[PDB]
């Protein structure tokens, strides 16, 4: 399946295999930045036409860039 970076997987060295999408979210806090790169499977994509998890999630107060890409090892921006 697809090849995405899992910023929390060490055994496979930051490489998670998914049949859904690569998920990269950058959170901008007042003193730190957190990048949650993870694999999202097909059944977790609901609705498939426009999943809410991968749907845009830009809220007020926090400059969060939710971002799902489709290529292999693309979830890095």
């Amino acid at each position: 399946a697809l090849q995405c970076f899992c910023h929390l997987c060490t055994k496979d060295n930051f490489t998670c295999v998914t049949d859904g999408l690569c998920f990269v979210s950058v959170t901008e806090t007042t003193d730190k930045v957190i990048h949650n790169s993870m694999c999202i499977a097909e059944i977790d994509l609901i609705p498939r036409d426009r999943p809410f998890v991968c749907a845009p999630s830009s809220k007020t107060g926090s400059v969060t860039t939710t971002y799902c890409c489709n290529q292999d090892h693309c979830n890095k921006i």
Binding site: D49, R50, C54, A55, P56, C68, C69, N70
Partner: protein
Amino acid sequence: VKFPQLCKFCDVRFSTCDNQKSCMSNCSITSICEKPQEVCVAVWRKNDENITLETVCHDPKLPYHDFILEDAASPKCIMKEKKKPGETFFMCSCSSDECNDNIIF
């Protein structure tokens, strides 16, 4: 991956909005455009004493009822002075979430 947009899918309907700077579509159904390239467009015809509103996703690079949107990338819907023979034809193009649901004249 750019995903579809959130436009109302109301088709043929009857509304009582006119002579207003802005008004709401009164539609009850916010829908996900079936294809990522579609945009929200609302058509407003005022025939005699009958006013009909129809609002659905539109494929900008294609004519719906033989017309072209000049501002298909706009975020908010603005009704422009469309011309038809003896028909107060109006159409707006917006490219945000549920933007066709709010209508500004």
